[PDB]
Amino acid sequence: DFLWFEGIAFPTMGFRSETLRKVRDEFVIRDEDVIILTYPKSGTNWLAEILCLMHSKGDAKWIQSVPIWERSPWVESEIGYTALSETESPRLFSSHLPIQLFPKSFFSSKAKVIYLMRNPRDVLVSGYFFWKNMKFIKKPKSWEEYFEWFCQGTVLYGSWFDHIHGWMPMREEKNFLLLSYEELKQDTGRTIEKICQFLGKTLEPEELNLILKNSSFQSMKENKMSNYSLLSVDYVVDQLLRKGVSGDWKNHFTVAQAEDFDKLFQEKMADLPRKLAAALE
Amino acid sequence: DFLWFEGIAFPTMGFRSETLRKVRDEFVIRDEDVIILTYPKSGTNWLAEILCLMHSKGDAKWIQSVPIWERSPWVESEIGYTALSETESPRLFSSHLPIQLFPKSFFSSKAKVIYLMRNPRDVLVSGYFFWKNMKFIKKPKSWEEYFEWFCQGTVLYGSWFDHIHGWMPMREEKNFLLLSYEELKQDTGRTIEKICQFLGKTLEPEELNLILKNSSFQSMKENKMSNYSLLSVDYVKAQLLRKGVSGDWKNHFTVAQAEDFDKLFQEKMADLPRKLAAALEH
Numbered sequence: 001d002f003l004w005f006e007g008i009a010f011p012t013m014g015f016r017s018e019t020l021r022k023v024r025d026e027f028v029i030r031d032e033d034v035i036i037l038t039y040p041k042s043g044t045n046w047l048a049e050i051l052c053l054m055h056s057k058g059d060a061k062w063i064q065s066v067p068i069w070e071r072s073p074w075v076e077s078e079i080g081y082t083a084l085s086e087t088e089s090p091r092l093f094s095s096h097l098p099i100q101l102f103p104k105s106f107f108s109s110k111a112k113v114i115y116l117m118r119n120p121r122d123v124l125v126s127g128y129f130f131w132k133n134m135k136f137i138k139k140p141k142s143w144e145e146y147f148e149w150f151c152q153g154t155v156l157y158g159s160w161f162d163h164i165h166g167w168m169p170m171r172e173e174k175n176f177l178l179l180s181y182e183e184l185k186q187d188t189g190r191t192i193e194k195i196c197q198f199l200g201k202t203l204e205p206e207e208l209n210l211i212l213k214n215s216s217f218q219s220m221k222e223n224k225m226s227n228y229s230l231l232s233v234d235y236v237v238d239q240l241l242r243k244g245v246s247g248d249w250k251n252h253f254t255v256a257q258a259e260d261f262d263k264l265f266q267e268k269m270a271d272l273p274r275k276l277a278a279a280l281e
Numbered sequence: 282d283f284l285w286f287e288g289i290a291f292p293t294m295g296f297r298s299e300t301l302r303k304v305r306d307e308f309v310i311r312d313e314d315v316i317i318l319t320y321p322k323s324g325t326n327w328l329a330e331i332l333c334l335m336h337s338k339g340d341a342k343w344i345q346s347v348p349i350w351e352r353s354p355w356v357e358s359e360i361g362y363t364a365l366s367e368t369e370s371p372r373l374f375s376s377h378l379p380i381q382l383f384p385k386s387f388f389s390s391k392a393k394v395i396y397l398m399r400n401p402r403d404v405l406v407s408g409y410f411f412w413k414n415m416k417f418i419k420k421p422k423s424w425e426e427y428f429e430w431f432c433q434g435t436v437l438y439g440s441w442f443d444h445i446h447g448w449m450p451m452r453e454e455k456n457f458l459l460l461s462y463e464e465l466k467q468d469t470g471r472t473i474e475k476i477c478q479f480l481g482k483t484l485e486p487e488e489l490n491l492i493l494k495n496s497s498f499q500s501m502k503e504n505k506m507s508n509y510s511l512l513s514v515d516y517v518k519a520q521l522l523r524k525g526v527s528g529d530w531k532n533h534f535t536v537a538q539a540e541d542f543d544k545l546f547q548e549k550m551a552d553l554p555r556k557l558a559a560a561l562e563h
C-alpha cells in the first residue's frame with residue numbers, strides 16, 4: 001500500500017511522515033539553491049544530468065563517478081533531506097512535491113526553481129512501465145486500472161492536474177523557469193540556452209556539444225552513475241531510461257482511452273492558458 | 282569541524298547528538314542481531330559484503346541490487362538508526378563506536394558481534410586518502426598533520442588505541458568474534474570458515490566459491506552497490522576500495538614516522554597480549 005501524508009501518496013520505504021512535515025514546515029531554503037520541480041516521470045533525471053553537465057562545462061568525469069541521486073538529492077526522501085540539511089551552497093536538488101507540501105521557507109527566498117512539465121499522457125505511460133515491478137508502492141492490476149488511477153490522482157504524488165495547477169501561479173516570478181519535456185527533446189540546444197540564461201551561465205560551443213552528447217538518452221543509459229535510482233525495485237522480477245522519446249502514449253492509449261482523457265484534460269485545464277497546453281505536444 | 286559527542290569526533294552531517302545519546306541508553310539490541318564492529322577503515326564493508334553473501338549463499342543478485350549501506354546499516358547514523366528500529370530480525374548492521382558509546386542493551390544480550398581489527402598503520406593510510414577530500418569532517422592540512430592527528434586520536438571516532446583497549450575485554454565472551462584484516466587477506470577461505478562456525482552457518486562448496494569470488498577486491502570494486510558509501514565527497518580520487526592490501530603503509534610512512542610510530546605503538550599496546558600485536562602484521 002501507499003504511505004499517505006496530507007492526502008498524497010508516497011512510497012512506503014525511504015520516506016517518513018515526520019520528515020515530510022519537517023520538509024514543509026522547517027527545511028531552510030537558501031537563495032543560492034537551484035531546484036528541479038517535476039511531477040514524477042516528467043524527465044527529472046534528464047534535467048538533473050544536464051544541470052550537472054552545465055556545472056562541469058561538459059566534462060563527464062564527475063557524473064560518471066558520483067551517482068546522480070547524490071549530485072541532485074531528492075529533498076523529501078530520507079537520504080536527501082538528511083544530506084541537504086548540511087550540504088554547502090550552492091545546493092542543487094529536486095522534488096516532486098505539489099505546492100502545498102513544499103518547504104514554506106521557499107516562498108520568502110530567491111532560490112531559483114525550474115519546473116519541468118510533460119504531456120500527461122506520456123507521463124502516465126512512463127509511470128506505468130516504471131512503477132510496475134517496483135516495490136514499496138501500491139501496484140495496479142492492469143493497464144486499464146493504472147489508467148483509471150492516474151486520471152483520478154490516486155497515484156504517487158497525487159493528481160498531475162493538481163500538481164500543475166498548484167505550481168503555475170509561480171510562473172511569472174523572476175526565480176521560476178518553466179520548461180517542457182517536449183521542447184527539451186525538440187530543441188535541446190535552445191532549451192539549454194534558456195537554462196543558461198536563467199541561471200546566469202555561459203558556455204563555449206565545445207562545452208555545449210559535450211553536454212548535448214553526454215546528456216543524450218543513450219549516453220545516460222550507459223552511465224551506471226546516472227541510470228541509478230534509489231527506489232527499491234523487485235530485482236526478482238526486473239529500467240529508469242525506457243525509450244526517452246515523446247508521444248509513446250499513442251502506442252498504448254486505445255482510441256477510447258484517448259477520447260476520455262482529452263475530455264478530462266479539456267475540463268481540468270479550462271482555467272489555464274492555451275499556450276500552456278500547446279507546449280505539451 | 283567535527284561533531285563532538287562525549288569526547289569523540291563524528292561527521293558533521295548524518296549524525297545527531299540526540300541520536301548518539303539514544304543509541305547508548307535506548308536502542309534495543311536483539312539476540313538475533315549480527316553486528317560488525319570496527320574502527321573506521323579496517324575493512325567494515327568488506328566484512329559486510331561477506332556476511333551478505335553468506336546470507337545469499339553466494340548468489341550475487343541481492344548485493345548487486347540493493348546498496349550496501351541498506352543491507353548493513355550504520356547504527357549510529359541518522360539513517361541507520363531509524364531504519365534498524367523498523368527492520369525485522371534477523372538484523373545485520375555495523376558500528377564504529379568505541380565500547381563506552383555502544384548500546385548498553387547489548388551487554389546483557391546474546392547478539393553476536395564480529396570485531397575486525399587492522400594494522401593501525403594501514404588504517405591511517407586508508408583513512409588519509411579516503412577522508413582527504415570528504416566533506417562534513419575536519420580536513421587535515423597535510424599528510425604530516427593527518428599522521429599527527431591519528432597518533433593523538435584527534436580524528437573520527439577517537440584514538441585507535443583506546444578503541445582497541447575498550448573492546449578487547451570482550452575477546453573471550455562467547456558472542457564475540459575477533460578477526461584481523463590481515464588474516465582475512467592471508468586466507469579468506471579460512472576466515473570465512475571461522476565466521477561460519479561462529480554464526481552457526483554451513484555452506485555447500487559451490488556456495489563458498491561464490492562467496493569468496495564475489496567478496497574479492499576486484500569483483501567488489503565493480504559493484505556500484507558496494508563500492509560506495511553515504512558520505513558526500515567534494516569530488517576531486519577517494520574511492521572506497523582503494524588498493525585493498527596489507528602493508529601499503531610502507532609506501533607513505535617516512536622512516537622517521539615509522540620509528541616514531543613504532544615507539545608509540547609499543548608503549549600503548551604493552552598491556553595487551555603480544556598475540557594480538559602479531560596478528561596485525563603482514
Ligand SMILES: Nc1ncnc2c1ncn2[C@@H]1O[C@H](COP(=O)(O)O)[C@@H](OP(=O)(O)O)[C@H]1O
Pocket residue numbers: 038039040041042043044045046122125126127215216217218220240241242243244245248
Ligand atoms: N537523456 C534522456 N533523454 C530523453 N528522455 C530521457 C532521458 N533520460 C531520461 N529520460 C526519460 O525521462 C523519463 C523519466 O522521468 P523522471 O526522471 O522524472 O523519472 C523516462 O521517460 P520514458 O519512460 O517515456 O522513457 C526516461 O526515459
Ligand SMILES: Nc1ncnc2c1ncn2[C@@H]1O[C@H](COP(=O)(O)O)[C@@H](OP(=O)(O)O)[C@H]1O
Pocket residue numbers: 319320321322323324325326327403406407408496497498499501521522523524525526529
Ligand atoms: N574485498 C576487499 N578486499 C580487501 N580489502 C577491501 C575490500 N573491500 C574493501 N577493502 C578495503 O577496506 C578499507 C576500507 O575499510 P572500511 O570499510 O572500514 O572503510 C580500504 O582499504 P585501503 O584504503 O587500504 O585500500 C578498502 O580498499
